[PDB]
């Protein structure tokens, strides 16, 4: 397992420090499940899909960290320390739960480490495959020669590889369609300007960066043919939690009769919730808002709010692109079909 | 004439360097009509209202710069050099035109300089007064104990003093109403986080700064009672041109049944245009987007778009707060009444 986002050295997990791009391309080596937790918590690694696989490995390292007392209790704490990092994206729990299950069924096997590491590996290789499929299904919805607006970074850096929303793009381009992407810088973290822009230019795909308060006007001016974004948590309802600001675009998209698509793997669909009001919303540190890449921009001692995600009601979504097909209204009715 | 935004030393114009706040509070001295132009062009001074008075003074300096040839041709050029700075805000032309008229009628007067400078001063003293009236008229629309979202900086630093949209706030507070403001940082320039936050904290008014992609969700969550912003150019139609991102707020406001108010002096209403499609929209340098206040944030050699304003159709505006009253639908019909 070796890609731009992460690399598995058998006994450690290397993560591209996404909080340092687009200028610095260094890596962070995680050796302790606590470090992977830290890398996730600090957003060194990020993007629902990639948080899971990365979480799965930190779990494997979790075993390699074991020393005394009960193995079960300790593996339970490793899982708890990793899950306690970031709320919203359900991929994290989905990964952890899948891994813990393997564990409970091989805890007595002497080749435990080999077995667990194997699933994590099996998992990463599936994400890239799942993504290329999402890209393929989404491509058919993108008419040649169009301008697609995106949000956050639902691409290579947000997954093991290829990406979800950006995967749909790479696939349309691969099919041979002239395409250009308007990418919101997406503050405060600036995934758009620092990550999406970067991996897209590095792939030879036409890219423009715009401030978040621009998307609206540009849609009204008729420069955007479609809006495609990723997700962190989709409910049985179809409501999807994604990077703060995704909701507003959805609203603006309806007002300008512009298709709004959510590209995400089935693993992002939380089967335990009915609607989007049940999705936990992460609140991050005040620094992210008062600063911008290092420098403080707001006055000293100012109050702020910092939700990292918002929720878009399903009625504002045209369709959900999955590795198993394009889901359309009635969502609750169709998602239930795909789930099985 | 002495306020935080600008000061008239009789033979030079001192402008608070708004592109350095909230940390550095230095001033820039303009002695040539060209320097005032430069200050305007670079946004050392900014905010429709303040751009006018500042332009009016750079005009008197224009006379002070006179040396040879025809006095009329030179003053015409001074006016042209000053008007060629920033497109959108009509306050600039309104000011320049008012000043040139005074000039044309006193050109042969021995006390020309004293006369022209006198109008400029008379103009500054009127703006502050006009604002306090806008503030008062708007205060009545704000219910005690409410949370108000603003955009850009339509406050003290955008006018000679007091401000327009923020004037409405200062006034509601003066009346004795518990009030707090959610101020969008407003990228790329960050007028919100750097200016609105600053002058509001310095006035002892509860303030929170949020990234632009947040307003939408926060409105849906029910934390915002009303949205009040300023304007750069309002048409007879009622459509108003304001800082890029204002249009989206208006849209998000309608969706969440939230009052949207535009506070601006009559001098911002352009009488020569019928609708908002006739408003010129300024496009500024790409650096403003690829950089954030100081450091480069986007990849080297990336494409971007940079509109400095967008247009909000009148049908999305609840009312326009003026020093002459609260204008309501039918705008075209009512605005025609306020003008006469
Ligand atoms: Cl709807
Ligand atoms: Cl409407």
From Swiss-Prot, chains A, B:
Pathway given in the UniProt record: Amino-acid biosynthesis; L-methionine biosynthesis via salvage pathway; L-methionine from S-methyl-5-thio-alpha-D-ribose 1-phosphate: step 1/6
Q: Which residues form a coiled coil?
A: none
| Swiss-Prot/TrEMBL catalytic activity | 5-(methylsulfanyl)-alpha-D-ribose 1-phosphate = 5-(methylsulfanyl)-D-ribulose 1-phosphate
Give residues annotated as binding substrate: 46-48, 86, 191, 242-243
- Which GO MF term does the entry hold, naming one? S-methyl-5-thioribose-1-phosphate isomerase activity
- Does the record carry Endoplasmic reticulum as a key word? no
List keywords of the entry alphabetically. Amino-acid biosynthesis, Isomerase, Methionine biosynthesis
What Pfam families does the record tag this protein with? IF-2B (PF01008)
UniProt keyword Isomerase present? yes
Going by the record, the broad EC class of this enzyme is: isomerase
Identify the InterPro entries for this entry: IF-2B-related (IPR000649), IF-M1Pi (IPR005251), IF_2B-like_C (IPR042529), Initiation_fac_2B_a/b/d (IPR011559), M1Pi_N (IPR027363), NagB/RpiA_transferase-like (IPR037171)
Q: What processes in GO biological process is this protein linked to?
A: L-methionine salvage from methylthioadenosine
Catalytic residues identified in the record: 232 (proton donor)
Q: Where is this site: Transition state stabilizer?
A: 152
Q: What is its EC number?
A: 5.3.1.23
Q: Which family does it belong to?
A: Belongs to the eIF-2B alpha/beta/delta subunits family. MtnA subfamily.
Q: State the protein's purpose.
A: Catalyzes the interconversion of methylthioribose-1-phosphate (MTR-1-P) into methylthioribulose-1-phosphate (MTRu-1-P).
- Protein's UniProt name: Methylthioribose-1-phosphate isomerase
Instruction: Name the source organism.
Output: Thermotoga maritima (strain ATCC 43589 / DSM 3109 / JCM 10099 / NBRC 100826 / MSB8)
Give the classification, highest ranks.
Answer: Bacteria, Thermotogati, Thermotogota, Thermotogae, Thermotogales
Please state the gene responsible for encoding this protein: mtnA
